Design an enzyme around this catalytic site. Structure first.
Site, PDB file in Angstrom:
ATOM      1  N   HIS A 138       0.884  -1.302  -0.033  1.00  8.43           N
ATOM      2  CA  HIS A 138       0.092   0.000   0.009  1.00  8.43           C
ATOM      3  C   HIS A 138       0.991   1.237   0.227  1.00  8.43           C
ATOM      4  CE1 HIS A 138      -2.581  -3.364   1.379  1.00  8.43           C
ATOM      5  NE2 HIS A 138      -3.439  -2.379   0.758  1.00  8.43           N
ATOM      6  N   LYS A 186      -0.750  -8.203  -4.388  1.00  6.36           N
ATOM      7  CA  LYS A 186      -1.586  -7.012  -4.430  1.00  6.36           C
ATOM      8  C   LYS A 186      -0.986  -5.626  -4.261  1.00  6.36           C
ATOM      9  CE  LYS A 186      -5.820  -5.032  -2.378  1.00  6.36           C
ATOM     10  NZ  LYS A 186      -7.075  -5.209  -1.602  1.00  6.36           N
TER      11      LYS A 186
END
Lengths: 196, 196
Positions: B98, B122
């Site tokens: 992130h 991700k």
């Protein structure tokens, strides 16, 4: 930021109410014969670009010039392989490049955008791999006033991604899909209202 | 592509009927020992990654291991900055990165993918320009089983559109949008239906 419906017949003028702009493919049907109030693009697609016009540059431009007089279009679509002398219509121009065999590399499509005569550049090339999406995203990442998307069943989604990278247009079909991967006017409108 | 709904309350469990997968966010609701029969991800998000778990990695992993035992999840979301030994959960792992300030250059993101411990990577980074769209598209173009999208309101489209480049997942919100730019489960399923 507009939906462009490609029209191939008089039936299709009624199907295009959801469209912002309408593309009059006079190689497919003579629209010269009646009035279109909607914002409009005059195209006469040569056989070699997947159209039905089969004749020399002379008869094609004469036919386009006579249709231009009587339709008064907002755009004419002219091809990237024509000389500068041909960009003599008194309206905005979509300068188009078609490739049904392949997506050229970034370098090759950058030359087309950079050597632009048209007000807008349109690029429509056969998608054969995910690297081609990359090529097109780069181009839109780096230039404005470009409609660039990939043709083919697998590459349908690039029609819509491009608008989000600055393309003024999404081209859509009315009636039936004219090629694999084409998106309906209804579908396109749904998708963009959903995405914002 | 599977659609993932991120759940934050027990009310949102009743709302995920059209999700393929649910993500149980245990930093925001103690999902521990909740009857979920659908494919699931266990995630306990740190404040530094935009969730609300505070204090020790000792505390956070203890919390996750107990939640594993009761919930028996299909995936666990583990952050890329963790050493190899954290990846001791007996299920499939989604390794995540992130960045709420920045989308890093391509070379930095490639490192996270090639240095992977989990089964899926991700990448969710803050979109700041169109060049960031191209970074994320090169990543998806060059690697398999990656989820990469840009966060923020101006780049929503990437959350759906970027998954057409081979991402296993689209992450969807349910109820209210949890962050700006988030895409609802409904809209995600409809765009996916309409695109093909």
């Amino acid at each position: 930021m507009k939906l462009v419906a490609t029209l191939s017949s008089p039936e299709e003028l009624e199907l295009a109410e959801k469209a912002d702009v309408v593309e009059l493919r006079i190689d497919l049907f003579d629209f010269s014969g009646a009035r279109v109030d909607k914002e409009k693009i005059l195209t006469c697609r040569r056989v070699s670009d997947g159209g039905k016009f089969e004749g020399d540059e002379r008869e094609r431009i004469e036919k386009m010039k006579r249709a231009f007089d009587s339709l008064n279009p907002d755009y004419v679509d002219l091809e990237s392989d024509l000389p500068d002398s041909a960009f003599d219509f008194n309206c905005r121009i979509i300068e188009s490049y078609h490739n049904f065999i392949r997506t050229p590399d970034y370098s090759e499509l950058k030359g087309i955008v950079e050597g632009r005569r048209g007000d807008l550049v349109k690029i429509a090339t056969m998608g054969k791999s995910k690297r081609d999406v990359e090529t097109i995203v780069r181009i839109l990442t780096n230039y404005d006033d470009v409609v660039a998307f990939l043709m083919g069943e697998r590459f349908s989604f690039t029609r819509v991604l491009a608008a989000y990278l600055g393309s003024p247009f999404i081209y859509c079909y009315v009636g039936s899909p004219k090629a694999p991967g084409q998106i309906s006017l209804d579908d396109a409108r749904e998708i963009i209202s959903r995405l914002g």
